[PDB]
Amino acid sequence: CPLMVKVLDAVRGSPAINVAVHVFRKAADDTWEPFASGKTSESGELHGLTTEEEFVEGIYKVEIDTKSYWKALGISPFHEHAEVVFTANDSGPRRYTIAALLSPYSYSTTAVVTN
Amino acid sequence: CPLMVKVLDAVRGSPAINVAVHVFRKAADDTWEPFASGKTSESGELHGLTTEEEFVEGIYKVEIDTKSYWKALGISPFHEHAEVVFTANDSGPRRYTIAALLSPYSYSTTAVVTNP
Amino acid sequence: CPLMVKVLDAVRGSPAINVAVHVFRKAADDTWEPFASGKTSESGELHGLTTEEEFVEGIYKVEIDTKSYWKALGISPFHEHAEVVFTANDSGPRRYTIAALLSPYSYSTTAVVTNP
Amino acid sequence: CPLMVKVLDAVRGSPAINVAVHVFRKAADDTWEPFASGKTSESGELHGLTTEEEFVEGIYKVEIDTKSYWKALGISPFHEHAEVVFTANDSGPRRYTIAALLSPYSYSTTAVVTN
Numbered sequence: 001c002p003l004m005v006k007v008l009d010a011v012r013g014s015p016a017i018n019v020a021v022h023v024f025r026k027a028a029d030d031t032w033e034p035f036a037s038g039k040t041s042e043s044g045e046l047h048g049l050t051t052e053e054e055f056v057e058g059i060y061k062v063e064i065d066t067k068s069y070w071k072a073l074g075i076s077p078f079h080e081h082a083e084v085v086f087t088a089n090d091s092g093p094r095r096y097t098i099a100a101l102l103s104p105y106s107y108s109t110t111a112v113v114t115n
Numbered sequence: 116c117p118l119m120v121k122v123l124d125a126v127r128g129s130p131a132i133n134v135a136v137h138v139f140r141k142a143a144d145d146t147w148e149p150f151a152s153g154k155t156s157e158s159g160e161l162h163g164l165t166t167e168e169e170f171v172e173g174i175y176k177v178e179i180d181t182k183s184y185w186k187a188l189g190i191s192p193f194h195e196h197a198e199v200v201f202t203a204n205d206s207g208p209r210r211y212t213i214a215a216l217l218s219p220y221s222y223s224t225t226a227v228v229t230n231p
Numbered sequence: 232c233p234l235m236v237k238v239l240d241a242v243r244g245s246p247a248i249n250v251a252v253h254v255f256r257k258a259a260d261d262t263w264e265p266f267a268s269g270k271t272s273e274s275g276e277l278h279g280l281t282t283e284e285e286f287v288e289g290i291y292k293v294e295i296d297t298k299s300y301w302k303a304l305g306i307s308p309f310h311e312h313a314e315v316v317f318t319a320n321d322s323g324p325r326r327y328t329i330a331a332l333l334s335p336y337s338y339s340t341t342a343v344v345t346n347p
Numbered sequence: 348c349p350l351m352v353k354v355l356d357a358v359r360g361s362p363a364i365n366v367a368v369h370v371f372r373k374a375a376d377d378t379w380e381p382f383a384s385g386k387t388s389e390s391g392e393l394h395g396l397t398t399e400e401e402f403v404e405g406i407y408k409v410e411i412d413t414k415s416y417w418k419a420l421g422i423s424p425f426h427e428h429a430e431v432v433f434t435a436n437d438s439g440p441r442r443y444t445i446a447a448l449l450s451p452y453s454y455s456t457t458a459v460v461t462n
């Protein structure tokens with residue numbers, strides 16, 4: 001698990017369950033090609049998106065469908081989705097956790113990058 | 116205005132209006148003495164808490180009554196309040212904005228510190 | 232001023248000054264068309280991006296160039312930028328403030344939406 | 348583990364390691380009595396603070412010594428510490444994770460409350 005995504009709900013104080021997540025890698029023509037996707041688990045987590053062989057250096061975009069998550073809960077959301085765009089850098093063995101904390105009109109995201 | 120408090124609502128996408136704020140200052144005997152208090156306005160801002168003369172070096176606690184705020188909107192929030200504790204003016208007088216972004220089970224706070 | 236962007240620095244406790252901001256609008260062919268751009272001022276605010284006439288219903292993307300900002304301070308940040316994507320004015324014209332609080336490996340964003 | 352504390356570093360993108368955490372419970376005279384404490388692990392986590400028998404309903408304060416954490420890294424911090432004050436409510440079996448994401452002039456905290 002070179003790449004994990006974790007999503008939390010700031011309104012209900014819970015994991016954000018069954019949230020669609022799409023990962024894209026930037027191509028040479030500078031467009032976003034699908035790379036991996038899934039739905040978050042009961043623990044708000046999404047594992048097994050990629051493997052260390054496939055997860056090469058490059059720019060990646062993690063898109064979290066926050067709008068559908070809120071809509072299914074009956075709450076009026078602001079954002080179309082939440083997007084996290086970052087460079088994967090090989091300099092040193094790294095595991096990446098992309099965490100997002102969601103509110104209807106706000107979100108915050110952080111990266112936890114470890115050996 | 117050496118100390119201003121700004122409060123936003125992350126559920127409604129609006130200023131957080133009518134939020135009670137209490138400020139304390141740590142006294143010599145190490146207890147929290149009441150220093151100033153007020154209510155955020157329609158813009159979510161609380162001005163006029165203190166003056167440059169009164170706002171001396173010290174350790175201050177800004178306690179924002181988040182629970183009352185959420186309860187009136189029908190939500191039973193996690194936190195009793197949000198408190199922000201910091202040393203002020205120890206390198207000379209500064210202007211401090213204490214900003215908070217509120218959700219029922221979460222909040223964020225940041226400080227903007229400027230030199231007049 | 233129907234659209235304003237405000238950017239704060241969580242490491243320095245200050246406005247984030249000289250941050251490039253690019254705004255796009257989703258066109259009919261579903262591509263992102265350049266809509267407006269600018270630089271945050273000394274107060275971390277970016278005013279004057281658009282007008283009530285120009286700022287029609289649509290899906291907008293506000294892209295904040297966080298990486299350039301951190302790089303100039305010597306920090307190699309995690310994110311390429313912060314992007315904020317939202318439908319605007321679909322219930323009539325509103326005023327939008329897009330606020331962001333920046334750290335090298337993290338950021339938060341919130342929207343304040345008011346009705347004039 | 349009825350109560351867990353997790354602390355992350357937003358500047359370095361890592362767990363906040365070896366951070367002192369103090370938990371207090373509010374007493375009848377409305378003063379804060381020490382309840383539990385520890386230092387965060389290598390994963391920025393602090394487990395085993397209490398047990399379900401001891402963790403009764405009441406108001407608790409979690410104090411995170413953020414100032415010492417930043418000082419030991421050579422970074423000038425704003426806050427004296429970060430404090431999280433909440434009511435533990437029995438209505439339903441609950442596990443509490445108090446998470447905090449730290450910057451030198453800012454922090455955010457959320458509660459993840461699950462069965």
Ligand SMILES: *B(O)c1ccc(/C=C/c2cccc(B(O)O)c2)c(Cl)c1
Binds near residue numbers: 108214215223239339
């Ligand atoms: B939590 O991660 C968080 C707290 C606070 C803010 C916003 C602060 C703000 C917004 C508009 C104006 C001012 B001011 O200096 O008058 C401050 C965010 Cl985005 C996130």
Ligand SMILES: *B(O)c1ccc(/C=C/c2cccc(B(O)O)c2)c(Cl)c1
Binds near residue numbers: 006008446
């Ligand atoms: B502030 O706006 C903020 C606070 C906390 C988080 C996420 C915390 C987290 C990350 C990974 C795992 C767990 B856990 O419950 O084991 C919690 C963010 Cl993104 C932002």
